[PDB]
From a paper:
To better understand the origin of this apparent structural heterogeneity, we used 3D classification to further partition the entire dataset of 765,883 particles into 10 subclasses. When the rotation between the two subunits is small, maintenance of the same conformation in both legs would lead to steric clashes between the two legs. The clashes are relieved by one of the two Domain IV legs undergoing a hinge rotation around the connection between the head and the leg, and we refer to this leg as ‘flexible’. This hinge rotation causes the flexible leg to swing upwards, closer to the ligand-binding head, increasing the separation between the membrane-proximal tips of the two Domain IV legs in the dimer. When the angle between the heads is at its minimal value (~10o), the flexible leg swings maximally toward the ligand-binding head, increasing the distance between the membrane-proximal tips of the extracellular module by nearly 15 Å (the ‘separated’ conformation). Thus, when the transmembrane helices are in the N-terminal dimer configuration, it is likely that the tips-separated conformation of the extracellular module dimer, with the tips of Domain IV at a larger distance, is favored over the tips-juxtaposed conformation. Dimerization of the transmembrane helices through the N-terminal dimerization motif is associated with increased kinase activity, so our structural analysis of the connection between the extracellular module and the transmembrane helices suggests that the tips-separated conformation of the extracellular module is associated with a more active conformation of the kinase domains, through its coupling to the N-terminal dimer of the transmembrane helices. Compared to the EGFR:EGF complex, the flexible leg in the tips-separated conformation of the EGFR:TGF-α complex is destabilized. Due to the more compressed ligand-binding pocket in the TGF-α complex, which leads to potential steric clashes between the Domain IV legs, TGF-α is less effective than EGF at stabilizing the Domain IV legs in the tips-separated conformation of the extracellular module.
The epidermal growth factor receptor (EGFR) is a receptor tyrosine kinase that couples the binding of extracellular ligands, such as EGF and transforming growth factor-α (TGF-α), to the initiation of intracellular signaling pathways. The extracellular module of EGFR consists of four domains, denoted Domains I, II, III, and IV. Domain II, which bridges the ligand-binding domains, contains the ‘dimerization arm’, a loop that mediates the principal interaction with the other subunit in an activated dimer. Domains I, II, and III form a compact unit that we refer to as the ligand-binding ‘head’, and Domain IV forms a rigid and elongated ‘leg’ that connects the ligand-binding head to the single transmembrane helix.
Author numbering:
A (entry chain B), C (entry chain A): 1 to 614
B (entry chain D), D (entry chain C): 5 to 51
Write the structure that this text describes.
């Protein structure tokens, strides 16, 4: 078996993209060589003599199927087998065919959906396509479940009369395309009461497993054509096999060698790195409200916070924000103190002009500083609009991670296109987990190629696309190439502030030429190209190095006294000990700290009683 | 064509039209911009 | 009345509990009026004229069924429907009928288990009972599972042949006894060709749900006879309905309205209280190593752990302890620092004597101090032998709770019987969650009737059987009543230390009437009737209050320098802050330590700037 | 009766037997004690 070539599926709903010639090219681009439409299938405005010899591979539509306003005569949806009907058109249907006539009543004529058997959800609509015969013969009781047989609306009228009668080798007047190959195959309304699901025959011995949607090949659940609920890499389960089983004898769970993490609508051995692994085995996009992310174990689990935890706000495109296009003026209030965004960011030029359709007034430019709190984002970042007054992306100077969970067009996490921006300004960016980045079309931007995003892409297959920006030769020759002394392999701004890759070293948020070893005011050491100050108690070494770590334990020589392994400023004189007994010490010859006589309560300046008078 | 109740409905210089049969309104997005109302830029093919 | 009565079932395979009349009484007390044996059904040494008519009620056996060494005429197991076979006799049998005869060959003759229809596990064995007839005609491939037909062992050599014919009104000359009702009713080898499990007739439209265990009445999951898996309040599920259902479309889990906790072979909506509610929604006895009791709002869940995870060792029997049956001097070491027993304790007389049949040497009575650290028992504590030298349960003074997951004889959690100890010595026992308390048969033990055991009982319905200890009117006339200062609740021993609660004051563990607030050296302060000594810096006034709060912020006068409410023994000598004002203190007129000045660079070893020379 | 390989088999003053038919050994627990080796005490029915 091989993974079926998926396509994202359009969502335009009767909107024409460009010219009649070009609208068809868009269709030719999205649905070419596609076998599983992950979204919706919309075939609109296809004009006469335009072929559709690429629609003969779609085997499954996960949303709805809209066929309207066409004029071509043969829309060959050949191998379509099931319309899962997740979404609906007009909130009712999962297959609409509407008003396919041209000017002189010569619209769609041959719609040979012979392999279609099942519609898991929704009704069907056929309307005002006056040149459509040969589908009135189909029986819509086998197709649609018994639940929706009331919502269904059908209308067929071929007033012309050039309707060919079809081959009599199949069900009473039931043919999709005129012939013997293209007539209906009933698999629900022909079988005895002893079957529940589909049934490939009238004999009680050829019944299909209830976890099969269109039809089966044998009697098992591994013999379906398309799986109804899940897919355990060989068969159509109903729920992914649990990770741990509970035996009712010893009253405790037990590992399961068949358990699979339930990701998406499949069962997998393990989940991708950027997803929230639950204990059930589920792999979610955003853990519960009370909970909050974990960091490691190789995965990204979610623990339960300790009360008031980092406020996260559902970004655009989820739940409360599905009616909203971008961050309007209205909906900007709820982004006050969100630390992370479980979602993705749409920055659309409608959020700066203010449309009267959604009754939304224009947004104000300085409001964008509310986004100075966020630190990472789960889905994608989509930047298309920005006030020309500002020279860089200021509201995003805290972001360090881009998870890219629900990416854009299924491809893009970062998308910075066609802006009057002169600097990206990403002094905080540390990784882009998944997706792709398109830094293209910006008027200036300049510093964009000298970043080496390859060091920011955690997963594989990710690619960048950096074109149509002010070339370096036209910007580097105008005093804009970034600063030196900071390992020039990376700069999100002209000053050395950012400089991804910090020279050979760095002093926190800034790059430097070398750590303060040997000399300098604060003594330092080097690990991972970072300069950390020594403990104040290490002696300034004018010869060799000073320390080999942060703690006073790694000093080469203490500045004052030495209490064992540690370098102390003054020997302890009141520190809590065992049995509630205080602790007093003294400095001897080599400034070493030794304990007082147990008796000496007021401390001691020497060993034993010969050290403390009182 | 669309009455001014739907003015400015089609973003990015849309050409809002009226489908006679269905009794519905819809956009005529410029090339390179997609979506129900010409909102998004077709990133997958150009800049 | 669906709570059908249950037994515990014996587990003494071929032993004889006394005489033939005592063994038959022990057999009657067990299985009289119960329908679901939870253990095993063993019927041994039952002589003639003993009427076993009390067995006609049993309907299910969760373990094996042994029927041996009888000489009775008929064993009326004529309502038994299934033998789950969770435990095998001789490692492979869930029904074994061996040697029911005496030395004249007139033994068992009628075993009319006409209703036995399923044996979910294990083979069957018959042997050497040369008066059993009308049972070789049973075809045992309909009853025994399809797998275990290779371990079976049956031979019916009734050479005497002194019984009736088999009615031809049942197929294949098969019958259990005489008459027409006592013959085989088949449900597995007469099914249709398509049936999944067992059936109800022969036609293809009768097969039962594949969860029905001993045949069904209708073709549903809610009309079985026995549920071969979990039962959910009317039905027979395969697994209990999970609490949360992962949504493959939005990639997020959401609660299930019919989700239920799996507690044993039942789906209950709420766990019993003394049962660890786990993450997967299933009541457990004791979760994995990396966990601990996180009691939270009543439910005893268990989190990851508190970092370094405390020691929890396995109890007797559970785990790697089934071989041995008490704490012998071979498994005492494994209890080194275990602070919580996962299981239960068994201290038995053979532990001190030293068993030769298992080769373990005697336990030295000084190795019981290893048990000094235990703080909680999840199952039960059974004590039957303590070194007569010792005078109380010293090894369990730190015992703090007995949960009661497992119980002895399915009823008892605390079992102190047949000892020579004088007082209990369980000074820190606070709660017996579930079980009953059997403290009986001790020659010389007082103080056991004073305690209010209703105060230690986590649930209702528990009761104590405290009887036949040292007489009530014999501890008065010896001085064996506890301290007059301990509250009327009770007392474990004679000391003022080992009481339930003090009357006026407590000091650590001891109970005292008037503690040291106004006199004595530990000048304390009363707080929750436990007066404790406060901050050690403020000596006792003439007779007045010495101190009122824990810290120095409450003492009236402090025996040393008084820095207002912030009393310390010395004057501060260089407290740290911003800009490092090395402010020291000194002894001014009113003994208050006043702030130093940076003018005297030598600190402040004298007063102010007029008394600060070298 | 039973050989010295099974001596001290039955605890609490046991009377270890030899089952002739099944060719196995067993106990003859004194009254009040239960178990395969007469180890436990029948708590439900006495002290």
């Amino acid at each position: 078996l091989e993974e079926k070539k998926v396509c994202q599926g359009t969502s335009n709903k009767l909107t024409q993209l460009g010219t009649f010639e070009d609208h068809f090219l868009s269709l030719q681009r999205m649905f070419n060589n596609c076998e599983v439409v992950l979204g919706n299938l919309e075939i609109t405005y296809v004009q006469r003599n335009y072929d559709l010899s690429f629609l003969k591979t779609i085997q499954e539509v996960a949303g709805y199927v809209l066929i309207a306003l066409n004029t071509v005569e043969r829309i060959p949806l050949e191998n379509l087998q099931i319309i899962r009907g997740n979404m609906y058109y007009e909130n009712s249907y999962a297959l609409a065919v509407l008003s396919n006539y041209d000017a002189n009543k010569t619209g769609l004529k041959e719609l040979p959906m012979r392999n279609l058997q099942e519609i898991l959800h929704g009704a069907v609509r056929f309307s005002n396509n006056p040149a459509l015969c040969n589908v009135e013969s189909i029986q819509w009781r086998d197709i649609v479940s018994s639940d929706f047989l009331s919502n269904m609306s059908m209308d067929f009228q071929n007033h012309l009369g050039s309707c060919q009668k079809c081959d009599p080798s199949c069900p009473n007047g039931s043919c999709w395309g005129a012939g013997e190959e293209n007539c209906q195959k009933l698999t629900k309304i022909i079988c005895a009461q002893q079957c529940s699901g589909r049934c490939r025959g009238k004999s009680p011995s050829d019944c299909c497993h209830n976890q099969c949607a269109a039809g089966c090949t044998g009697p098992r659940e591994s013999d379906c054509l398309v799986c109804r609920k899940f897919r355990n890499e060989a068969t159509c389960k109903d729920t992914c096999p649990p990770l741990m089983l509970y035996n009712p004898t010893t009253y405790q769970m037990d590992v399961n060698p068949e358990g699979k993490y339930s990701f998406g609508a499949t069962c997998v051995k393990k989940c991708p790195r950027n997803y929230v692994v639950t204990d059930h085995g589920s792999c979610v996009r955003a853990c519960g409200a009370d909970s909050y992310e974990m960091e490691e174990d190789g995965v990204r689990k979610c623990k339960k916070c300790e009360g008031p935890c980092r406020k996260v706000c559902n970004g655009i495109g989820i739940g409360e924000f599905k009616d909203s296009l971008s961050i309007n003026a209205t909906n900007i209030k709820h982004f006050k103190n969100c630390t992370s965004i479980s979602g993705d960011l749409h920055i659309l030029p409608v959020a700066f002009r203010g449309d009267s359709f959604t009754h939304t007034p224009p947004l104000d430019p300085q409001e964008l500083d509310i986004l100075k709190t966020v630190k990472e984002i789960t889905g994608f970042l989509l930047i298309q609009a920005w006030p020309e007054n500002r020279t860089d992306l200021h509201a995003f100077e805290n972001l360090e991670i881009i998870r890219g969970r629900t990416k854009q067009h299924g491809q893009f996490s970062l998308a910075v296109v066609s802006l009057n921006i002169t600097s990206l300004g990403l002094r905080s960016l540390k990784e882009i987990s998944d997706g792709d980045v398109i830094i293209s079309g910006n008027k200036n931007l300049c510093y964009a190629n000298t970043i080496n995003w390859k060091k920011l892409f955690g997963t594989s297959g990710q690619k960048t696309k950096i074109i149509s920006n002010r070339g370096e030769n036209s910007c580097k020759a105008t005093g804009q190439v970034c600063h030196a002394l900071c390992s020039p392999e990376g700069c999100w701004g002209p000053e050395p502030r950012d400089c991804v890759s910090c020279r050979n070293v760095s002093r926190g948020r800034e790059c430097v030429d070398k750590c303060n070893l040997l000399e300098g005011e604060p003594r330092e050491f080097v690990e991972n190209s970072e300069c950390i100050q020594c403990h104040p108690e290490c002696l300034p070494q004018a010869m060799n190095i000073t320390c080999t770590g942060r703690g006073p334990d790694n000093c080469i020589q203490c500045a004052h006294y030495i209490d064992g392994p540690h370098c102390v400023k003054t020997c302890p004189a009141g520190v809590m000990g065992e049995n509630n007994t205080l602790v007093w010490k003294y400095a001897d010859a080599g400034h070493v700290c030794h304990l007082c006589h147990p008796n000496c309560t007021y401390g001691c300046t020497g060993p034993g009683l010969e050290g403390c008078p009182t | 064509e669309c009455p001014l109740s739907h003015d400015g409905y089609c973003l990015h210089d849309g050409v809002c039209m009226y489908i006679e049969a269905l009794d519905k309104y819809a956009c005529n997005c410029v090339v390179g911009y997609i979506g129900e109302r010409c909102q998004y830029r077709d990133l997958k093919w150009w800049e």
